Design a protein around this ligand. Structure first.
Ligand code: BCL
Ligand code: BCL
Ligand code: BCL
Ligand code: BCL
Ligand SMILES: CC[C@H]1c2cc3[nH]c4c(c3C)C(=O)[C@H](C(=O)OC)c4c3nc(cc4[nH]c(cc(n2)[C@@H]1C)c(C(C)=O)c4C)[C@@H](C)[C@@H]3CCC(=O)OC/C=C(\C)CCC[C@H](C)CCC[C@H](C)CCCC(C)C
Ligand SMILES: CC[C@H]1c2cc3[nH]c4c(c3C)C(=O)[C@H](C(=O)OC)c4c3nc(cc4[nH]c(cc(n2)[C@@H]1C)c(C(C)=O)c4C)[C@@H](C)[C@@H]3CCC(=O)OC/C=C(\C)CCC[C@H](C)CCC[C@H](C)CCCC(C)C
Ligand SMILES: COC1=C(OC)C(=O)C(C/C=C(\C)CC/C=C(\C)CC/C=C(\C)CC/C=C(\C)CC/C=C(\C)CC/C=C(\C)CCC=C(C)C)=C(C)C1=O
Ligand SMILES: COC(C)(C)C(=O)C/C=C(\C)CC/C=C(\C)CC/C=C(\C)CCCC/C(C)=C/CC[C@H](C)CC/C=C(\C)CCC=C(C)C
Ligand SMILES: CCCCCCCC/C=C\CCCCCCCC(=O)OC[C@H](O)CO
Ligand SMILES: CCCCCCCCCCCC[N+](C)(C)[O-]
Ligand SMILES: CCCCCCCCCCCC[N+](C)(C)[O-]
Ligand SMILES: CCCCCCCCCCCC[N+](C)(C)[O-]
Ligand SMILES: CCCCCCCCCCCC[N+](C)(C)[O-]
Ligand SMILES: CCCCCCCCCCCC[N+](C)(C)[O-]
Ligand SMILES: CCCCCCCCCCCC[N+](C)(C)[O-]
Ligand SMILES: CCCCCCCCCCCC[N+](C)(C)[O-]
Ligand SMILES: CCCCCCCCCCCC[N+](C)(C)[O-]
Ligand SMILES: [Fe+3]
Lengths: 281, 300, 240
């Protein structure tokens, strides 16, 4: 079925591979070559998860956990049950994520819109590969990657973080958090502002964008504008994820001590480093 | 191809003094200078700003809070400017000790000053909340901003006021300090058996992540259809254009369903407020109802 | 059945109702779903259509009630390519002129968008008292080059979003003396020229014209922007 205004857009063309062979829809979903590839990787990866569940001995989704190979395996291959499934499932997940992004690109072309969406999705893919590929490789073992389990992968975050004391002190970690908090802050303000203008007080006619500008100038003396807030929201969310991958790719590769120690260069500058008093004196 | 991340050609005209409606124009400043810097990313105009009783009260009360923490840091620094800059992030204004309970009779150097600072912060935040309400009201707008703000206040109220009272001790509140409040966050989880296994904490994370997910989708979507004037969302709501249609169809073809130009902003406001809404619940239940979240989790 | 268990169970119930509410709210446009012949589709999903809401539009522009009877209010020059559903509908004529596919436009009101004071939101800079180029390259006077690397005209004015203080269109003078508007988001201002990768020099004349030299309507904006974006797919054969 279609939306009332959808038919005029369902024209042929825009594909990157296969011409018109996969240029069609299944219900609302557009297929395309990379829709087929996505389905292929996704189906295969899910079969390997089910197969790992059988080896594990449970069909409870809360317990299923596919672990990477032990550290002793280094960066070589491992038997399916002893880390190989994680390796293959990681290959399929990458194929699915990348196929998904290229499918979005084909949809941008058919609709004549910009490519901002798949470009933003690629930052999320980057963060995934930072944890399962880049950081393990640089450290020299797939075992440093995280396990595929609802709860076991939270334990990995806790074990990895506390290996370096309080991970809070990772300075790139602080920056990434600031963008996550600021992003949610900006998202709430933006959603609230449009709704407040489209849904004014009772007995009032719909507001204009000038009211949105005026409201924020009255509130904090500046309005970024209708275009600027969408630029901002894109930048806040991508910067948050960028510094996330940054704060981890440096952990265990060029930094190995507790992250609080990193802040010593400031405290122990030879001039004020010895002045008695204060917290550090 | 031009991507519309930075303005190519800035244009500038007479300053926009803004809509009037029922705003008391006596409390509006003049217009500030234009910022070519900001003009590359958004609007270049600074000001005017509205400055009423609440704003004055909020700003003053807020600076008192800032100054109170300040003189304490200078005092911890022995009034030495060098030590002040060295140990700036290590200074901390802690709440009263547990023995004082919920009493305000703690001497200034043993939590009395933390109580004074919290009072100023309390007045500054709440008077600012009333500000977000009256500014919308003066322009005949909905109060979505004020209600969304309550969600953030909810968590802040739980961390420093509501939960400590229910626990019966101001010592359960958060200290004022850069590093000190990070450490407080760390000890809080360890004491309560790993917050990872607090379900409201996991829910809060899903919405924090989901907020970055949704705003990246929405920001990218509006820029991709800005070639059709898609960022003029209020008129797209009143008169759907090809921008709104292409935006909806991209996501329908991608994941099977879609939003409207208005409806996406209800997804956005709820995705964001749910972060601090669920978070405040998770913290409020920690120590009051559940001492160990990991253990509590194993029984459910 | 401790208070924590009841809170988390209560929340999940609240979240299900919230999602049901959010999804129905996002069905105020484009629904009910149609078959490819225009008839109502048999399967409309599990979520029902929301009850109508009314916006009172400012400046005496009337009221909008959504959801309501939908209409394209324009012909669609396409035709099925398959008896079964889910396949592309092929243009029957010239898709850029017929405004289909990436060249699509919506039958918006043939009126200009207004600002909070009831004045035209978009105006040519020659009619905008006080507005000027404050940073970056001033494109006025520059030649405009198409994807075929041929010149189509020269920029003669900038149409500005006055409330936002933002450039939205370049008014380009064609070799025949007439002018056209070009979305600001589809041009590339360079040191010595303006480059438009979406169109070839001989497709600029096909851009829809406006009926007033000092204002542009929402309908005109959609026809202009759709035509230019449509060039990316349909002007590609002569894209060097
Ligand atoms: C949520 C659990 C913890 C907590 C854990 C963290 C962690 C972890 C981090 C911060 C970070 C910050 N926190 Mg803290 N923080 C808490 C409560 C607070 C409160 C409060 C009113 O309760 C305040 C004012 C702050 C203030 C701040 C800033 C110094 C900084 C950036 C915030 C930001 O992006 O703001 C958005 C506002 C604007 C952009 C304006 N925190 C609670 C108690 N906070 C980060 C930082 O840089 O710390 C040094 C950081 O890494
Ligand atoms: C005890 C634990 C430690 C700690 C240790 C760590 C460690 C270790 C790490 C972080 C990382 C992060 N931490 Mg920390 N962290 C702590 C405390 C905090 C606090 C806090 C208030 O106390 C905060 C706010 C944060 C914040 C954050 C973020 C900056 C970051 C996670 C986001 C991210 O990278 O997303 C990135 C986004 C993704 C990976 C998503 C990718 C999605 C892919 C592309 C697609 C999936 C498709 C899906 C399967 C399909 C499903 C289809 C169905 C239809 C649904 N941490 C404490 C001190 N933190 C992580 C980080 O930076 O990672 C890079 C990290 O590894
Ligand atoms: C980012 C830094 C850390 C990390 C730290 C944390 C922490 C800390 C928490 C989570 C939480 C979650 N994480 Mg994790 N997580 C990481 C990497 C991942 C990846 C991945 C492919 O990289 C995935 C798919 C997940 C998935 C999940 C969910 C089970 C859950 C809710 C997230 C959410 O809604 O996000 C925002 C996205 C949306 C709102 C959109 C919808 C996405 C849905 C929910 C995805 C479901 C995935 C499904 C269960 C797995 C695939 C199924 C396949 C069919 C096999 N994590 C890395 C290693 N994650 C929380 C939780 O409750 O865990 C139990 C939690 O507390
Ligand atoms: C040891 C570390 C613990 C842990 C301990 C805690 C604790 C403790 C808390 C959190 C909280 C949060 N944690 Mg945790 N957290 C851990 C691991 C993680 C990981 C991870 C990757 O593993 C992630 C992604 C998170 C993520 C999160 C967030 C979802 C949540 C904060 C929401 C928010 O927006 O607060 C930011 C927003 C606010 C604080 C609201 C404040 C708004 C006020 C009104 C504004 C102040 C205005 C002021 C006057 C302005 C001027 C200030 C100047 C800047 C100085 N945590 C581990 C398990 N986490 C909080 C929560 O809700 O938990 C359920 C919380 O209290
Ligand atoms: C980069 C900024 C933020 C962001 C942006 C972003 N995400 C995006 C996009 C964008 C712009 C899309 O366009 C795309 C989309 O279509 O969204 C609706 C997407 C998307 N972000 C998603 C999830 C997601 N994003 C996240 C984060 C973020 N996304 C960032 C915060 C997170 C987390 C944890 O924070 C998650 C969970 C999906 C809903 C969607 C991508 C869907 C996709 O790729 O589909 C193809 C894949 C499948 C259909 C299934 C693959 C199955 C695998 C073969 C097996 C599973 C292996 C996996 C490792 C299991 C591990 C589970 C455990 C860890 C629990
Ligand atoms: C709902 C979830 C998110 C959120 C929303 C939110 N914050 C808000 C609002 C909203 C809806 C406002 O309307 C209000 C505001 O005016 O923003 C510009 C505000 C605000 N959020 C602020 C800060 C802030 N919000 C935070 C977080 C969040 N705010 C959440 C992530 C954080 C942290 C620690 O992450 C901080 C530091 C202020 C800039 C502002 C409130 C101003 C104030 O209280 O001033 C009084 C004090 C002085 C004048 C000094
Ligand atoms: C203003 O402009 C905008 C819109 O229009 C006006 C929008 O509409 C949206 C979309 C946003 C929403 C609808 C909000 C809800 C989304 C959320 C909360 C994000 C979280 C999303 C989800 C949890 C959904 C995830 C769903 C999927 C990944 C789909 C599942 C995948 C399947 C079924 C497979 C896909 C199909 C194929 C690969 C092809 C089929 C293959 C064959 C072999 C046949 C945005 C951003 C926007 O700015
Ligand atoms: C030159 O330097 C001078 C001295 C001029 C300065 O000004 C320098 C000053 C600074 C550098 C200040 C630096 C500031 C900080 C480090 C602040 C850090 C803040 C945080 C980490 C956030 C902590 C907030 C959490 C809490 C606990 C908030 C309390 C809120 C409560 C809801 C209020 C509780 C109220 C109480 C107890 C009583 C008051 C009265 C009532 C009726 C409620
Ligand atoms: C130069 C002085 C600036 C003072 C800033 C105070 C601190 C705000 C911090 C973060 C939120 C980001 C603000 C942007 C939120 C705007 C939400 C929105 O949608 O705005 C659209 C536009 O502003 C209307 O048309
Ligand atoms: C990992 C797969 C990568 C696919 C991403 C393809 C998107 C192309 C983005 C080009 C334009 C991006 N931007 C931000 C400059 O507009
Ligand atoms: C400025 C008044 C508001 C502050 C509210 C909290 C009371 C502060 C108590 C300070 C300590 C006083 N005393 C006598 C116990 O030392
Ligand atoms: C604490 C969560 C608050 C809910 C956030 C969503 C806002 C919806 C409320 C609509 C406001 C209606 N009104 C009439 C005041 O404008
Ligand atoms: C408004 C958007 C709704 C998004 C809902 C996302 C649900 C994520 C599930 C997180 C699991 C949390 N829990 C309870 C298992 O700890
Ligand atoms: C946990 C998140 C769940 C999101 C799943 C969304 C499914 C895609 C939408 C289905 C609509 C298509 N169909 C075939 C049912 O009509
Ligand atoms: C036994 C009751 C426990 C309460 C658990 C929380 C359930 C409701 C939470 C949603 C709050 C609703 N609100 C205020 C956002 O409209
Ligand atoms: C399955 C029924 C569950 C009912 C729980 C209540 C959910 C309602 C969500 C809020 C509705 C939106 N609103 C009007 C408050 O903005
Ligand atoms: C975490 C977000 C999950 C939201 C999923 C709910 C949306 C369901 C989509 C309904 C299908 C729409 N349709 C096919 C009838 O047009
Ligand atoms: Fe928007």
């Amino acid at each position: 079925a279609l939306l009332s205004f959808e038919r005029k857009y369902r024209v042929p063309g825009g594909t990157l591979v296969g011409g018109n062979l996969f240029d069609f829809w299944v219900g609302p979903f557009y297929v395309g070559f990379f829709g087929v590839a996505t389905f292929f990787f996704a189906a295969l990866g899910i079969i390997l998860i089910a197969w790992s569940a059988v080896l594990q001995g449970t069909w409870n989704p809360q317990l299923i956990s596919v672990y990477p190979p032990a550290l002793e395996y280094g960066l070589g291959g491992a038997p399916l049950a002893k880390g190989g499934l994680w390796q293959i499932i990681t290959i399929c997940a990458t194929g699915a994520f990348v196929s998904w992004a290229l499918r979005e690109v084909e949809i941008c072309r058919k609709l004549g819109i910009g490519y901002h969406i798949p470009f933003a999705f690629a930052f999320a893919i980057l963060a995934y590969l930072t944890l399962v590929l880049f950081r393990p490789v640089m450290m020299g073992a797939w075992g440093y990657a995280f396990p595929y389990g609802i709860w076991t992968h939270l334990d990995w975050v806790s074990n990895t973080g506390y290996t370096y004391g309080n991970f809070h002190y990772n300075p790139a970690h602080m920056i990434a958090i600031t963008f996550f908090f600021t992003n949610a802050l900006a998202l709430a303000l933006h959603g609230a502002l449009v709704l407040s203008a489209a849904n004014p007080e009772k007995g009032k006619e719909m507001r204009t964008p000038d009211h949105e500008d005026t409201f924020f100038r009255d509130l904090v003396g500046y309005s970024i504008g209708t275009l600027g807030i969408h630029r901002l929201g894109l930048l806040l969310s991508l910067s948050a994820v960028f510094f996330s991958a940054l704060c981890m790719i440096i952990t265990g590769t060029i930094w190995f001590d507790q992250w609080v120690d990193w802040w010593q260069w400031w405290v122990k500058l030879p001039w004020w480093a010895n002045i008695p008093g204060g917290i550090n004196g | 191809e031009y991507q519309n991340i930075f303005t190519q050609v800035q244009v500038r005209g007479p300053a926009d003094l803004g809509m009037t409606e029922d705003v008391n124009l006596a409390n509006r400043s003049g217009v500030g200078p234009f910022s070519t810097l900001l003009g590359w990313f958004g609007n270049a105009q600074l000001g005017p700003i509205y400055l009423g009783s609440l704003g004055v009260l909020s700003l003053f009360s807020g600076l008192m809070w800032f100054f109170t923490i300040g003189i304490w840091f200078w005092y911890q620094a022995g009034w030495n400017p060098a030590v002040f800059l060295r140990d700036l992030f290590f200074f901390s204004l802690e709440p009263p000790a547990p023995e004082y309970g919920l009493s305000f009779a703690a001497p200034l150097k043993e939590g009395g000053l933390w109580l004074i600072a919290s009072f100023f912060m309390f007045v500054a935040v709440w008077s600012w909340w009333g500000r977000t309400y009256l500014r919308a009201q003066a322009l005949g707008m909905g109060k979505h901003t004020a209600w969304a703000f309550l969600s953030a206040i909810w968590l802040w109220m739980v961390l420093g006021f509501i939960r400590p009272i229910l626990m019966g001790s101001w010592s359960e509140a958060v200290p004022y300090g850069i590093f000190s409040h990070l450490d407080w966050t760390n000890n809080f989880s360890l004491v309560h058996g790993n917050l990872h296994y607090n379900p409201f904490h996991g829910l809060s994370i899903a919405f924090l992540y989901g907020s970055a997910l949704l705003f990246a989708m929405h920001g990218a979507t509006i820029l991709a259809v800005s070639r059709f004037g898609g960022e003029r969302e209020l008129e797209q709501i009143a008169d759907r254009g090809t921008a709104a249609e292409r935006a909806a169809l991209f996501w329908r073809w991608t994941m099977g369903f879609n939003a409207t130009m208005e409806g996406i902003h209800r997804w956005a406001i709820w995705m964001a407020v749910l972060v601090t809404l669920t978070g405040g619940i998770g913290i409020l239940l920690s120590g009051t109802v559940v001492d160990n979240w990991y253990v509590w989790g194993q029984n459910h | 059945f401790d208070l924590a268990s009841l809170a988390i169970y209560s929340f999940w119930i609240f979240l299900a109702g919230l999602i049901y509410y959010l999804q129905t709210e996002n069905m105020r446009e484009g629904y009910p779903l149609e078959n490819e012949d225009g008839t109502p589709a048999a399967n409309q999903g599990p979520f029902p259509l929301p009850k109508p809401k009314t916006f009172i539009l400012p400046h005496g522009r009337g009221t909008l009630t959504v959801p309501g009877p939908e209409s394209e209010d324009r012909p669609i020059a396409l035709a099925r390519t398959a008896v079964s559903e889910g396949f592309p509908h092929a243009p029957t004529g010239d898709p850029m002129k017929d405004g289909v596919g990436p060249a699509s436009w919506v039958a918006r009101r043939d009126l200009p968008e207004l600002d909070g004071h009831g004045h035209n939101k978009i105006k040519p800079m020659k009619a905008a008292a006080g507005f000027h180029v404050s940073a970056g390259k001033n494109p006025i006077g520059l030649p405009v080059r198409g994807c075929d690397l041929e010149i189509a005209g020269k920029v003669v004015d900038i149409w500005v979003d006055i409330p936002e203080q933002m450039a939205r269109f370049l008014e380009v003078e064609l070799k025949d003396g007439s002018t056209r508007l070009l979305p600001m988001q589809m041009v590339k201002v360079q040191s010595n020229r303006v480059h438009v990768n979406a169109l070839s020099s001989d497709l600029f004349a096909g851009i829809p014209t406006i009926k007033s030299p000092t204002e542009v309507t929402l309908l005109e904006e959609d026809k202009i922007c759709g035509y230019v974006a449509g060039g990316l797919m349909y002007a590609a054969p002569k894209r060097k």
